[model samples]
Target: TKYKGYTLLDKYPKEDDFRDAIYIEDMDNNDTSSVVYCFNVTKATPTFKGSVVKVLYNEQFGSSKLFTEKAIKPRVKGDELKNSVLRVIYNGYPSNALGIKEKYQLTEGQFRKLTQRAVWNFTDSNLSLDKLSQKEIDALNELINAKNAIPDNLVLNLYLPDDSYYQNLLGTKFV
Candidate 1:
């Protein structure tokens, strides 16, 4: 029997528009079973560079919510030293559930810089900024701010999977 499914694909329109679309499907059977697909633009096409989109799934009040969002922009730069880099400021943290009033507050510069280190770990890997040309770094910074293209206070549903966990436990397990 077919089950419900959801897929998310994100890519630069200029680079690869077809992969940028996200798809979701509901089967006639179970309501729980779902599938997700993420198109790795960085790996699939080396020359392709753009924003890093995120597909967030959450369960609330016996229903599932899927959110397709984009984080920062990534770009390919330099003729010889081709590299993918992103310069972004990550915001909205702690969350209201934490009981912290300023949960969505923007982090300070020191903390922000520290956060960049973690991003660098994944994107640039072992590469050093000093080795990259100034122009290349500038291009990276431009793409990073693409999130600014989106408006503030975007209503996004945060997934609460624990609720589903309890419900599943209360029910019978598959043999």
Candidate 2:
């Protein structure tokens, strides 16, 4: 999917030749066992200079790497925060009220729309369950049921791979 005209790249060391590198210098100074870094490339050159992983000695008697089995956190859009709970519930339903093709395929835009609708509907003080029509009540109930079914680890794999590091360490190409 395209986000703000940025198409997700399929492979690392992308067309721009972006790559990841371990800063041995930094690791040595910090007395660390290993280091991992992620970077973007543009025009066959690394565009950024930052290490995503700087393993330092841990008090646990082992080295620590930030990327070790870490999952990406779900990013709730600002517009959707108001109805996030309801949106989540709606997302659980098989039918896509918001035109989401699949539960897992929901785009950021769809999520935002659901959130906005939720905030508007649930926050209205004048709105009361007693006053809701049967259809409205059913919709509300569906949302409730769906929300309860949403998993805590929903969309955990949304983060892009730290391809630069993989390329450097494994001699594999991400792009």
Candidate 3:
């Protein structure tokens, strides 16, 4: 049997010089506890930097490190921020829409309150949700759904701008 989930790629370090070896962290868990090892990587596989991947795992460990058979979906470098990275990060964790369910213990109905504070964290305190465009509102809505539902198992069609720290932590201006 196999398990499917999302993960982050940490290509094997050159310091160890372990050829074909790689490390994968399960992002769907919303934590860093489920890193698995793979030693059969090809040159054309696992090539994204800090992007999430939908993977199929062969849990041959009987109770240990999963061996990935395929990276079913990969996030391209040019196609991020169209989705809320933070929302995706906290997908399976718990509690609040912000993935800090244990921190504030907020509910989905209070999303406006949370988004206001989150936006304020990166932007201006005075920038309220009313000032956001419909596109941003829709994106925020997708993020909110991700936050509210416990292990909300669904794909999102959200999109954001190049400079939107509101969705992307690092904007396009980072260069």
Candidate 4:
């Protein structure tokens, strides 16, 4: 039978639009029944043997690339790529710097630096002036005094087959 299933492909906090992505690669061999172990991408395929899944979040780009909704279907085990686990890491998220200069009352140059820093820099929460670069965040700041956002909430916990204690909870072996 042909496999038919899909999960969400949404971006998350601190996600890099240009780099962060998901895709699949082919395996050494693929036979119908046994090949499910090596199925493989967007517009990708599967087999009975199964395919291998690779993830590239940061520093190391994925062997592919996130998320979710509904079931009642399947794919060749290894060939099936799911990214509910992909997420950006940070010690803490920069609160919207609406007041980076406006409310804090700083020089024009100081405002430029803070905004710049928020974009490229990641993985450090101890930044004295940590800030987020969400397009909306900076725009809204100019409109009004608003520091409304949470950047540290990454949902990165789901059961793996090796540690399938919760596997059966869903009434299935793959749970």
Candidate 5:
């Protein structure tokens, strides 16, 4: 198994990385906080970054002194962004098809039906969106926006936290 003078191994090879493109940067916590910059490929506008109080600023530097300064800042919550990451979490914190089905324990058939419909489109999924209370519609809106943010081929998928930014932000190690 040699290529002129080199041996190839069955492992995480280099070429496999170039296979896909969409949401490439979705891995990092770069503050529009497009997933493009988060992934290792580009810093172009992947999507509108979400707003999560001040905590929404999930990134700072790309150099050695990264993520250290933010430690002094306090954590906040409940931000509003029409195009937001949090939009993926609604209806008891389960808005995306993933959240809606798995987080709340809804079945897949229920998942497809519920996830695809636009509340305004109205396919007898009512008694769901209340009259006096529009929380259901709100949740639907969030899910819709989140879905639209992604490409159609992957619409069925949710914004799963990409593993790239995992220990990247943690200041201390937990061994």
Candidate 6:
């Protein structure tokens, strides 16, 4: 059975900095109200299993929903590849000046330097950047240097399993 139309309700405020414990609400099969609180999510699978989700804002309800009408896939593809790359550059390494610049507005040259350093931290060797294909290099550079788009709000993929606690609220075991 395929599960689709789940909305990321909200993240717990007091959860640890490393992993996010968030609430996901079903948009169908449960009156758009059944929710599951998944735990221990970071820059990894089962949570961010696919490409990032696009958000939709509700004027009347004053809620910002994500991946409202789409099926949650296990893996990313095509244009999703582009979005995944951006998610890595932005979300994976938050201290990489992207956050600082967004908060304090760093200079373009300094931001570039910080962005380059942050990108390099993933690689061990100096020539790692050169090893990437020209297209890959250009894509990274474009995100690093682009304006208008900072991607401050990143919504990752959802891979929900029915064995969660919410599925059977009175069950003895926590699946």
Candidate with maximal lDDT: 6
**Candidates in descending TM-score order:** 2, 5, 3, 6, 1, 4
Model 1 reaches what TM-score against the true structure?
0.19
Regions more than 4 Å wrong, model 4: 1-97, 123-175
lDDT of 3 by residue, 85-127 (tens): 3333343122134444333443332332334333322222122
True-structure RMSD, every candidate: 16.7, 16.8, 18.9, 17.5, 17.7, 17.5
lDDT per residue (tens digit) for residues 44-115 in model 2: 222223434332211111111222212122123323332343343344222245434343343333332233
> Runs in model 2 with CA error above 4 Å?
1-116, 119-133, 144-147, 156-175
- Assess candidate 3 and give its TM-score to the true structure: 0.20
Compared with the true structure, model 5 gives a TM-score of 0.20
lDDT per residue (tens digit) for residues 12-100 in model 4? 23232211221222223252211011111111321112224322111111222211221112221111223211111111112222344
Candidate 1 backbone collisions, by pair: 58-159
Give the alpha carbon lDDT tens digit for every residue of 1-175 in model 6: 2342223213323221122222233333453322222211121212321326422111111012322212123133344433433333452233342354444343433333333332332221121344344444444454444443535454333333443322111000112
Q: Clash totals for all models, in order?
A: 1, 8, 2, 25, 4, 0
Q: Which regions in candidate 6 have their CA more than 4 angstroms from the true location?
A: 1-85, 91-99, 125-175
* Cα error, candidate 3, residue 135 (Å): 59
True lDDT of residue 91, candidate 4: 13
lDDT of each: 0.25, 0.28, 0.30, 0.23, 0.25, 0.30
The deviation in Å at residue 124 for candidate 2 is: 8.3
What's the ranking of the predictions by lDDT, best on top?
Answer: 6, 3, 2, 5, 1, 4
lDDT of 1 by residue, 123-154 (tens): 33422344333443443333333233322322
lDDT of 5 by residue, 85-120 (tens): 222322212234345445444443333223323321
TM-score pick, better of 4 and 6: 6
Where does the lowest 10-residue lDDT sum fall in candidate 6? 166-175
- Which ten-residue region of model 1 has the weakest summed lDDT? 166-175
The local lDDT score (0 to 100) that residue 48 gets in candidate 5 is 22
Report residue 77 deviation for candidate 2 (angstroms).
14
